[PDB]
Amino acid sequence: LSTASVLAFERKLDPSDALMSAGAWAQRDASQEWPAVTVREKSVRGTISNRLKTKDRDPAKLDASIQSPNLQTVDVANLPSDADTLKVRFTLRVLGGAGTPSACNDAAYRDKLLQTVATYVNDQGFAELARRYAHNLANARFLWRNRVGAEAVEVRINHIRQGEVARAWRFDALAIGLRDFKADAELDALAELIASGLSGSGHVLLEVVAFARIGDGQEVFPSQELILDKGDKKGQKSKTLYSVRDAAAIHSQKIGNALRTIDTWYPDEDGLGPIAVEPYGSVTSQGKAYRQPKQKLDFYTLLDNWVLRDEAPAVEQQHYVIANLIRGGVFGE
Amino acid sequence: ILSTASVLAFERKLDPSDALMSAGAWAQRDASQEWPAVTVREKSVRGTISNRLKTKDRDPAKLDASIQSPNLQTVDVANLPSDADTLKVRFTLRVLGGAGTPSACNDAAYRDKLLQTVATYVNDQGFAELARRYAHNLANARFLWRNRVGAEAVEVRINHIRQGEVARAWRFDALAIGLRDFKADAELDALAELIASGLSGSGHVLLEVVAFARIGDGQEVFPSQELILDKGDKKGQKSKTLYSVRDAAAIHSQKIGNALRTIDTWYPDEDGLGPIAVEPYGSVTSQGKAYRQPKQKLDFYTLLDNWVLRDEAPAVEQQHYVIANLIRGGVFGE
Numbered sequence: 001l002s003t004a005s006v007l008a009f010e011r012k013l014d015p016s017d018a019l020m021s022a023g024a025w026a027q028r029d030a031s032q033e034w035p036a037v038t039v040r041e042k043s044v045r046g047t048i049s050n051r052l053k054t055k056d057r058d059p060a061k062l063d064a065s066i067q068s069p070n071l072q073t074v075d076v077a078n079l080p081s082d083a084d085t086l087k088v089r090f091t092l093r094v095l096g097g098a099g100t101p102s103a104c105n106d107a108a109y110r111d112k113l114l115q116t117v118a119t120y121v122n123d124q125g126f127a128e129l130a131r132r133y134a135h136n137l138a139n140a141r142f143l144w145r146n147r148v149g150a151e152a153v154e155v156r157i158n159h160i161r162q163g164e165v166a167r168a169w170r171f172d173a174l175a176i177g178l179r180d181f182k183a184d185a186e187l188d189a190l191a192e193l194i195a196s197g198l199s200g201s202g203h204v205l206l207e208v209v210a211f212a213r214i215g216d217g218q219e220v221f222p223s224q225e226l227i228l229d230k231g232d233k234k235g236q237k238s239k240t241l242y243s244v245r246d247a248a249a250i251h252s253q254k255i256g257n258a259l260r261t262i263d264t265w266y267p268d269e270d271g272l273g274p275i276a277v278e279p280y281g282s283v284t285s286q287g288k289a290y291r292q293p294k295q296k297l298d299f300y301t302l303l304d305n306w307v308l309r310d311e312a313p314a315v316e317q318q319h320y321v322i323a324n325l326i327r328g329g330v331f332g333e
Numbered sequence: 334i335l336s337t338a339s340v341l342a343f344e345r346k347l348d349p350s351d352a353l354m355s356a357g358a359w360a361q362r363d364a365s366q367e368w369p370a371v372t373v374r375e376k377s378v379r380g381t382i383s384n385r386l387k388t389k390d391r392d393p394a395k396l397d398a399s400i401q402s403p404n405l406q407t408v409d410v411a412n413l414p415s416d417a418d419t420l421k422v423r424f425t426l427r428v429l430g431g432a433g434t435p436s437a438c439n440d441a442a443y444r445d446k447l448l449q450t451v452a453t454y455v456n457d458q459g460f461a462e463l464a465r466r467y468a469h470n471l472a473n474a475r476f477l478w479r480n481r482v483g484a485e486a487v488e489v490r491i492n493h494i495r496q497g498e499v500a501r502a503w504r505f506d507a508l509a510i511g512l513r514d515f516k517a518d519a520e521l522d523a524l525a526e527l528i529a530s531g532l533s534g535s536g537h538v539l540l541e542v543v544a545f546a547r548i549g550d551g552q553e554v555f556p557s558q559e560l561i562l563d564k565g566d567k568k569g570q571k572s573k574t575l576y577s578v579r580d581a582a583a584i585h586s587q588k589i590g591n592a593l594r595t596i597d598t599w600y601p602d603e604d605g606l607g608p609i610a611v612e613p614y615g616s617v618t619s620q621g622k623a624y625r626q627p628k629q630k631l632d633f634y635t636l637l638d639n640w641v642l643r644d645e646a647p648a649v650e651q652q653h654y655v656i657a658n659l660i661r662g663g664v665f666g667e
Contacts, residue, residue, distance in 0.1 A: 025497065042351075042576060042585055043560040049613045051634055051667055057627050062614065067621045071560055081353055081423075081578070084497070145344070149429045151495075151537050215425045215494075215539050217350035219586070235560055287340055287439040 001308055004106035004332055011328035012098050012198065013133065013259055018090035018142065018250040020220060022083040025152070025213050031087050036247035037077050037220055043235070045071045071235040077220050077248040086146055086212045086220050090255055091160075092137075094197030094204035098126075098326045105332075113307050120322055121199065128319055129326065130195035131188070132262035132274075135181050138190070140173040140210050141258035142250070145221040147173070150212040158207040159193060165207075167193075173210065179273045181264075198326065222248040260327055265316040266290045267297055277323040299324045335446060335642050338666055342437040344429075345662035346532065347467065347593055351576075352424040352476065352584040354554055356417040359486065359547045365421055370581035371554055375409045375571065408573040411582040415551040420480055421543060424589060425494075426471075428531030428538035432660050443641070450641050454656055455533060462653050463660070464528035465515070466596040466608075472521050474507040474544045475592035476584070479555040481507070486547040493527060494539045501527075507544065513607040515598075532660070556582040596657055599650040600624040601631055611657040633658050634665075 023034040048065050056062070079086060099117025104110040140147045140155060147153055153173035159166045169186050176182070197204030214220070225240035242249050260277045264270040268290050275281055275290055279299035282289035291297050302321050305311040312318070357368040382399045390396070413420065433451025438444040470476075474487045481487055487507035493500040503520050510516070531538030548554075559574040576583050594611045598604040602624050609617050613633035615625030625631050636655050639645040646652065 043558075044585075044587065045618075047612055047614075047616045047618055049616075049663055051665070052627060059623070059626050059628050062623050062626070063621065066614075066616045066618060066623055073560060078350065081350075148344075149427055151539070215350070215427055216541070217353075217425055218427060219348065219350070285437050286441065287437070288441065 001108055001112065002106070003304065003308065004104050004109045006103050006105045007101050007331035008103040009325055009328045009331065010095075010102050011256070012095040012326045013092065013256060014095065015092045015252050015255045015259065016090045017244065017252045018088045018255055019244060020077070020222065020248045020250070021087045021089070022079040022220075023085055023087065024083060025085045025211070028085060028154075028211050031085075031209070031211070034087055035080075037079065037086070037222075038246060039075050039077050039222065039241045039243045039248045041073055041237075042076055043071065044074050044238075045069065069234065072238040073235055074237070074239040075241040077222050077241060078217055079214060079220060081217045084213060084216050084218075086143075086214055087209065088143055088146065088212070088250070089207070089209045090142070090250075090252070092206040092208055092259075094194055094206075096198045096200035098198055098322070101331075109307070116307055117322070117325065120318060124315075124318075126195040126198040126322075127191065129262065129323055130193075130198060131191040132181055133259055134187055134190040134194050135176065136259050136261055137206070137208055138171045138173070138184075138187050139176040139178060140212065141178075141261055142208075142255040143173075143210055143212055144250075144254065144258065146212050146214070150174075150214055152211075152213040154211055156207075156209040156211075157190065158209075160205045160207055161203070220248065223251045223254050260323065262323060263320060265320055267295055277320065277327050279324060279329065335443060336440065337638060337642065338435075338438045338440045338443045340437045340439050341435055341665035343432075343434075343659055343662040343665070344436050345590075346429045346432055346660045347426065347590065348429070349426045349476075349586045349589045349593065350424045351578060351586050352422045352589055353578060354411070354556060354582045354584075355421045355423070356413045356554075357419055357421065358417060359419045359545070362419060362421070362488070362545045365543075365545070368421055369414070371411050371413060371420070371556075372580055373409050373411050373556065373575045373577050373582050375407055378406050378408050380404050380406070405569045406573075407569070407571045409571065409575050411554045411556050411575055413548065413550070413552055413554060418547055418550045418552075420477075420546045420548055420554050422477060422480070422546070422584070423541070423543045424476075424586075426538075426540040426542060426593075428528050428540070430532050430534040432532060432656065447641050451656070451659070454652060458649065458652070460529035460532040461525065463596070463657055464532060465522070465525040467528055467593055468521050468525040469510065469515050470593045470595055471540070471542060472505045472507065472518075472524065473510045473512055474546065475512070475595055476542075476589040477544055477546055478584075478588065478592065480546050480548070484508075484546045484548050486545075488545045490543045490545075491524060492541040492543075494541055495537070499541075554582065557584045557588050594657065594661060597625075597654060599654050601629060611654065611661055613658060613663070637665075 020037040021034040022037050023031055140153045155171040155173050157169040169190055196202045222241040225242050227240050230236055257276055261274050263277050263281055264274045266281055275283055280289050280293055281291040302313050302317055306313055354371040355368040356371050357365055433448055474481050474489055489505040489507045491503040503524055530536040557576045559576050561574055591610050595608050597611045598608045600615050614623050616623045636647050636651050640647055
């Protein structure tokens with residue numbers, strides 16, 4: 001038995017684009033008619049503040065560079081001048097059937113993989129993974145820079161059966177820490193619901209609303225788009241923000257990156273907090289890959305040892321491997 | 334061995350908002366909440382030729398024929414109403430905290446050395462000096478750039494906001510406080526203690542700043558000026574463009590934040606010529622020159638690399654400069 005040359009898993013925990021709207025705290029309960037946050041433009045001139053490569057470090061060339069115009073246009077999203085609360089609303093489906101691939105050559109391989117995933121789901125629930133996922137919904141990881149420096153964040157999660165709410169949670173995203181996966185009662189109810197979604201035992205749809213109290217006219221942070229560089233005189237646009245029909249917005253995959261930041265089991269540390277579930281789990285901001293393949297805790301090494309050769313790894317690394325299967329991805333050679 | 338991170342990036346602390354401008358009467362400024370905003374509106378203008386000509390176009394037929402064809406332009410102007418002499422400028426400010434910690438770093442040994450360095454700073458010398466100077470720049474009205482020039486009465490009002498209600502209010506005379514002389518006060522040092530509490534994570538600082546500037550009935554206010562995609566259009570279209578938010582004239586947030594970090598008196602030219610803004614390479618654009626060259630050794634990158642990599646701590650004043658650059662933020666690294 002060997003690996004299939006094609007494996008492909010579809011993602012569970014399938015979120016929507018979060019849309020941003022602004023208003024007043026303690027009108028927070030009536031945040032249904034709040035106007036959107038519009039991506040706008042302003043002009044920018046900067047000065048020379050990057051490093052110099054010691055051949056542009058002559059003083060006359062530097063002063064000629066400073067006398068040069070350095071203009072460009074950027075996109076900004078701010079709250080209004082009479083609105084101090086940011087509202088961020090997305091939805092989320094938990095699907096389940098989280099070990100069945102969607103494109104698999106080798107029929108013996110997918111049989112032994114389903115045996116292994118079914119063994120996991122038999123002797124352990126999706127209980128730890130749903131506990132961790134419901135933490136990352138309970139705090140406001142999906143408010144990336146919008147949470148940074150906010151004085152009051154709260155999260156409102158409504159489970160939706162029809163055009164109607166089954167159950168409503170209301171959390172306090174600053175009391176629920178960014179590090180400690182603690183214990184709570186309503187959070188354990190949400191973890192039971194997400195674990196019933198991941199196991200295949202019900203329909204899970206969430207309405208995740210989060211309110212960050214920021215300040216009047218302060219800047220909010222939609223996720224940034226991708227533009228190509230040209231040599232336009234006196235400023236081509238240097239920054240594009242993402243939006244929908246005239247409303248600033250966060251990409252769905254950035255929210256989904258916040259929700260699968262449950263990995264505290266990597267060999268470096270766990271006082272450094274959870275990192276996101278990636279094969280050979282890498283952080284792009286810190287520029288390095290935790291969980292290298294040569295120090296054998298990689299997803300591919302653990303999966304090859306555990307499916308092809310029956311070497312069951314440690315329990316926490318099994319949580320990591322099943323978290324990669326809930327993530328989805330393009331596997332195989 | 335230790336080397337610099339090939340990617341460094343710091344998020345800005347002390348981040349202001351856009352300053353919306355409104356107008357009314359002095360001694361009505363104690364109820365200045367429903368003042369109408371200064372609106373940007375267009376007017377025609379028609380100059381003559383006044384450029385410094387070369388020594389080829391100074392023939393009298395050419396110059397007279399240039400006067401024969403005048404330049405017709407549309408500009409936009411922001412004035413006060415003709416029965417309103419006080420300019421109100423209002424913005425909020427957040428002093429975040431966590432200054433030395435980068436937001437992108439390739440080399441996690443360099444990251445720990447930089448964090449040890451900033452913690453050695455904050456433990457030895459707090460944010461007292463920096464917040465004292467930033468409180469000067471809030472207390473005088475630098476963020477009124479040309480709105481302040483020639484005004485006779487500037488009054489700054491800074492509130493602190495815990496929930497939508499005022500924790501503590503300050504009032505100032507921004508012309509009694511200098512533009513150059515960092516003197517000592519008591520309310521200003523209370524504001525400095527608040528900002529130094531904010532800069533080190535010890536608390537929450539949100540500051541509603543309002544600056545009244547009595548100018549004169551009908552006079553001109555100066556919002557910040559936008560950029561044009563003028564594509565050689567027909568016979569002088571709109572050439573000057575001002576900034577507004579919702580038909581209400583405004584200043585950019587980065588121009589205000591420039592005015593807040595005009596702290597740097599430590600550049601090797603003179604403290605006597607007054608403070609410049611805390612940039613790397615000390616670059617002042619209107620002067621056209623770089624104070625604090627990298628050829629001399631008071632640059633941000635030279636001081637930062639000597640104080641982080643090679644353990645050579647600079648003078649205390651240059652430590653205030655380097656920590657103020659980290660509060661500024663920016664894309665450092667190669």
